[PDB]
Nucleic acid binder design. Structure first.
Length: 174
RNA sequence: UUAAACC
């Protein structure tokens, strides 16, 4: 079972922090991998998520746009989509363009900085108690804030849990 | 709906 209480204590022989799931993955002092970075999208709008599952365009919020665009410079960047009120996992996707003002989804509003293209990896409408728990403690033990970056081990565990449910025919949406 | 990466 994953426990972050001692995550800072997982270290290699050089003193670098390493992942609790895969000890070969070197992390910064925030638990983030320079190679693979994960952001949560807390979805409150059925129209937006259904349109994004069809068209693969997402609107990024002003408050998280700079950090996401900076992460896209040298890492693979993933968005994990979670329904805000129920914490159902809706899927996860890789960001395959940077922020731009040329291609916006029609549902974007003044909260959004611009658009990105995504490539869906899995889609679902899934309840999992461990996904719920990870989202509920993502901000230092308190609930995730929309657009926040999470730790490598949180992103990787969420992808594993989504994949596992889909392969068991649980929470599929297609 | 075969995560990616690392091995």
């Amino acid at each position: 079972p994953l426990n972050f209480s001692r995550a800072s204590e997982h270290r290699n022989e050089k003193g670098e922090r390493i992942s609790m799931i895969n000890p070969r993955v070197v992390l910064d002092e925030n638990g983030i991998s320079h190679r693979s970075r994960y952001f949560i999208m807390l979805c409150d709008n059925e129209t937006a998520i259904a349109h994004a599952k069809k068209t693969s365009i997402w609107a990024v919020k002003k408050d998280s746009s700079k950090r996401i665009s900076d992460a896209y410079k040298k890492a693979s960047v993933y968005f994990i989509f979670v329904a805000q009120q129920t914490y159902n996992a809706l899927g996860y996707a890789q960001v395959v363009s940077d922020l731009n003002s040329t291609e916006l989804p029609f549902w974007s509003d003044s909260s959004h900085a611009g658009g990105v293209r995504i490539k869906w990896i899995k889609t679902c409408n899934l309840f999992s108690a461990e996904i719920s728990e990870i989202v509920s403690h993502m901000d230092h033990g308190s609930e995730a804030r929309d657009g926040m970056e999470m730790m490598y081990d949180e992103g990787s565990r969420l992808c594993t849990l989504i994949n596992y449910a889909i392969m068991k025919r649980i929470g599929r949406d297609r």
